Design a protein around this ligand. Sequence first.
Ligand code: TYR
Ligand code: ZN
Ligand code: ZN
Ligand code: ZN
Length: 446
Amino acid sequence: QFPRQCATVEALRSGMCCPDLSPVSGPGTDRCGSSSGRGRCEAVTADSRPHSPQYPHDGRDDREVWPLRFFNRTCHCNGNFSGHNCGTCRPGWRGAACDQRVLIVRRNLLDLSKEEKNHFVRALDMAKRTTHPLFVIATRRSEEILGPDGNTPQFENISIYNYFVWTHYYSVKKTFLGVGQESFGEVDFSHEGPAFLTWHRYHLLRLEKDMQEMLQEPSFSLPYWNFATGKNVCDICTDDLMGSRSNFDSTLISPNSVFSQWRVVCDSLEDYDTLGTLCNSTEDGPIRRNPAGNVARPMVQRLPEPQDVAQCLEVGLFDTPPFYSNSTNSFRNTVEGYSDPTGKYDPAVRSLHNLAHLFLNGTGGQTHLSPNDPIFVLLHTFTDAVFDEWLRRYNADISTFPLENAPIGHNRQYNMVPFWPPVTNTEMFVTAPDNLGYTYEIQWPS
Ligand SMILES: N[C@@H](Cc1ccc(O)cc1)C(=O)O
Ligand SMILES: [Zn+2]
Ligand SMILES: [Zn+2]
Ligand SMILES: [Zn+2]
């Protein structure tokens, strides 16, 4: 979503989100940091190629051809500068001139020290409470974007972690057709499609950078959760980590974990699809979690098994047609978890990433809401680690990633929704240690 600078009336009608960085001579003088060498305001590149027929309603949704329904001018930064301003560096780079290489290691959460574990938890909690310095979030769609009196832009501040929750939600939201109409649900800009891995890759990358600056610890790194242990229990659901089960309510978090204080955003789906609003920054109920607790669906009461991971890393093609949740022999669908680990589709199966989510039987198992459970972060860094080792192993072969006729949002050169500045699936489809400034301290079953 957009920087405060662009959540204006002036920017929203220029269609230009190109804020100043060091406005030496006054407003408009140093857009994208062109006083220094750092970048320029420029036309926006966005994918025009067609998408799967599954989504009929082109013309209705503001996530189509993202981000062109809100802005047609963006900053493009030079070299290894990056950021809405070109005010910072590309991932893996720091310094005033973005020429000092940095490499951070995402470790297994259970291998961290007592003080590392505790630093992580309170960082999360701090990110849940601290206002995001950059981004605000839209409470209404583009029609009512400038509010009732056409001169009050409908954006709210929001905490760092809730932004993480909100962007995921905005990408899964249903298409509003009109009051009295039934909203459209066969659309997911981040799941059931080849953008699933790269969307969630950047998602994590933006939370990590935000926490790096909130803590001002450039080396801060997001640990991972090896959820592929075949276990009957959540081995990170302890009070020093992500919170044990409440003894007063089997679906709540132990009051001795700070996460029992957290209150969720984006739970009022009935309001969003009825009135046409969007998730705002007003928190509601608490997190709901009950590992293994879904007695109604026994498939989901046990986590994936270590081989499940070893089998999916042998699926050689990244994705296969129709590039959807029912593709066979697609690595992206296998580790997403709509096929079994060998690649074989079945509408009943749930493996790997999906089954980790379902196992929680709670807030973490509902797509519009699962980031509210901070196990999400650990759940997707591990999903990303598997992605990263597939990229190492098959030499980042993006040939199977379709350029056309993926479900809308999942074409290879689609700008991933709603990240800003616009960033494509291709930009994330690279091995992370050499290109994105991070690596995984991890070993793989064989
Ligand atoms: N909804 C998925 C699982 C899932 C849940 C929440 C998510 O955020 C993502 C995936 C399923 O049908 O198995
Ligand atoms: Zn350019
Ligand atoms: Zn997701
Ligand atoms: Zn997920």
